Amino acid sequence: QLSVIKEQATEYQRLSSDTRLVIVNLNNNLITDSSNFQGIVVNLNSKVQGDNG
């Protein structure tokens, strides 16, 4: 009984680690999109500031 439980738990620990690894790609995707948008905004501002001149 206890060995069957320790094995199930071992499988789920692996599943949890895989899951977290999927979540690094997710975080990195969101981080990229955010960085991209910041840059979008920053350069549009440079264009507007030059035009106001």
Partner: protein, 48 residues
């Protein structure tokens, strides 16, 4: 008897101190400037 009453008071004082000392203050996220906003406030002092 006065002693017994004072102990009661002493426990009062202790739960007071316990209330002072509890909790884990959470993260505070400040608000520093982005580049769009720094260039503006600067463009602000210079053209007026």
């Amino acid at each position: 008897t006065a002693a017994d009453t004072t102990v009661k008071t002493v426990l009062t004082d202790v739960t007071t101190i316990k209330a002072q000392m509890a909790g884990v203050s959470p993260l505070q996220v400040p608000q520093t400037d982005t580049i769009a906003n720094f260039v503006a406030r600067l463009a602000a002092l210079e053209h007026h």
